[model samples]
Target: AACSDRAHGHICESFKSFCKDSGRNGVKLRANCKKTCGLC
Candidate 1:
């Protein structure tokens, strides 16, 4: 399958805004926002 960001509705917008921010041991964005975070 192809890679893509797994977000929806308000979460989609939120992911767009904070997908690259740093966090404790990293952020959920790395997994949830794969395409957005460039994991694809």
Candidate 2:
């Protein structure tokens, strides 16, 4: 995941914390996070 400067403030920190495991579960995890961010 990409880390960002404090302008985005810890948003980037939480950003990297998701979907560490790759596979179907990872896909689901990413999709869910995306939905939360209104990207779905």
Candidate 3:
């Protein structure tokens, strides 16, 4: 996953339903996901 789009894909995959259930913000959610797993 060169630019690590796959990483975001997984984050969004799980975070999507989770965000809906818990009312989380998409932008911040993605930032945090990558912070620990991607090009941090």
Among all candidates shown, the one with the greatest lDDT = 1
lDDT of 2 at 7: 27
Which lDDT tens digits does candidate 2 get at residues 1-40? 4332332433423654545546664455455454423333
Stretches of candidate 2 off by over 4 Å are 1-18, 35-40
Runs in model 1 lying further than 4 Å from the true structure: 9-13, 24-26
Please give the range of 10 consecutive residues that has the lowest summed lDDT in model 2.
Answer: 3-12
TM-score of each: 0.49, 0.34, 0.27
**Clash totals for all candidate models:** 0, 0, 0
Q: In model 2, how large is the Cα lDDT of residue 12?
A: 29
lDDT of 3 by residue, 1-40 (tens): 2333334466655664443333346454545454333344
What is the C-alpha lDDT profile of model 1 across 1-40, one tens digit per residue? 5777775535545666676679731377766667766777
lDDT of 3: 0.46
Descending-TM-score candidate ranking = 1, 2, 3
Once fitted onto the true fold, the runs of candidate 3 whose alpha carbons sit more than 4 angstroms away are: 1-7, 21-27, 30-40
Q: How accurate locally is residue 19 in candidate 2, as Cα lDDT from 0 to 100?
A: 53
